[PDB]
Design a protein around this ligand. Structure first.
Ligand SMILES: CNc1ccccc1C(=O)O[C@H]1[C@@H](O)[C@H](n2cnc3c(=O)[nH]c(N)nc32)O[C@@H]1COP(=O)(O)OP(=O)(O)O
Ligand SMILES: [Mg+2]
Length: 260
């Protein structure tokens, strides 16, 4: 059985550059079914038992672009063994916004902390093991330009899979949001897989139109969820989508502070 490694990150994070280094000239290109979004994959040049599934460069997993939808559907399909998340070290906080959402899918994340050579030139520093510790994911510093850390991150990702990793270490948000997520999980029951339950619970909280349309929820489930959102919005005096956005960035800021 092939180990399937999903490669994803923001646009201009160096994902293509790393894809090309990892796979060399041996790639397969097409489209995702029913859409014109490119579907690209390649075997790891130095370990052909590993397949890299490239995913479109995105900033978030929102319902508003074909590229974001392709990434989400693929990651929620449970076909990937590992997520290899390419992160631009020179724009860390902005890049980790997506990372928090990737962790929540329940497919173990490994980070290629890319552009590390640029960071050195800007007079900036990132303490890699502290960043890893506080994100709850492996992190390996890479440079696609200098060609460093690449084989190392691929090896880590290959040994950090849905088979090898036990409990999910997910970003923990404010107690008030966690209460809402917990109650949505109770309402969900077995309507979604345990592995991705948190992804779905957060999406429901923020009234993601794709999840709402796809899930077969009872009238009672929908009423329970509506109630949870209403009271949670009242206690934050903020709309549900904004609450989640603010909590993601707060977590990211805390991690980046504790990692310097
Ligand atoms: C002809 N080329 C240029 C001429 C002048 C200026 C830039 C370019 C140009 O091509 O920049 C590319 C990279 O080479 C560089 N780049 C990528 N990784 C690294 C890295 O680790 N370090 C450095 N210094 N640069 C990197 O960052 C860019 C984005 O990498 P993409 O892979 O495209 O990102 P997505 O796949 O969208 O995620
Ligand atoms: Mg250290």
């Amino acid at each position: 059985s092939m180990t399937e490694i999903a490669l994803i990150g923001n646009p201009a994070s160096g994902k293509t550059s790393l894809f090309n280094l990892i796979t060399g000239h041996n790639q397969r290109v097409g489209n995702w079914p029913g859409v014109t979004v490119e579907r690209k994959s390649g075997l790891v040049k130095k370990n052909k038992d590993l397949e890299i599934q490239d995913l479109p460069g995105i900033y978030s997993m929102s319902p508003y672009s074909p590229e974001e939808k392709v990434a989400r559907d693929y990651l929620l399909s449970q076909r990937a063994d590992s997520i290899l998340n390419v992160v631009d070290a020179t724009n860390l906080e902005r890049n980790l916004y997506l990372t928090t959402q990737l962790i929540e899918t329940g497919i173990p994340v490994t980070i290629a902390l890319n552009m590390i050579d640029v960071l050195d030139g800007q007079g900036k520093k990132i303490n890699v093991d502290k960043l890893s510790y506080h994100l709850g994911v492996p992190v390996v510093a890479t440079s696609a330009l200098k060609q460093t850390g690449v084989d190392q991150v691929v090896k880590k990702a290959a040994h950090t899979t849905t088979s090898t990793v036990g409990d999910l270490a997910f970003p923990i948000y404010d107690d008030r949001l966690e209460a809402a997520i917990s109650q949505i999980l109770e309402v969900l029951g077995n309507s979604v897989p345990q592995r991705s339950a948190r992804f779905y619970a957060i999406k429901l909280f923020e009234q993601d139109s794709l999840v709402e349309a796809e899930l077969d929820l009872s009238q009672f489930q929908r009423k329970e969820i509506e109630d949870i959102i209403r009271i949670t919005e009242e206690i934050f005096t903020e709309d549900a989508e904004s609450i989640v956005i603010n909590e993601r960035y707060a977590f990211i800021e805390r991690v980046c502070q504790m990692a310097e």
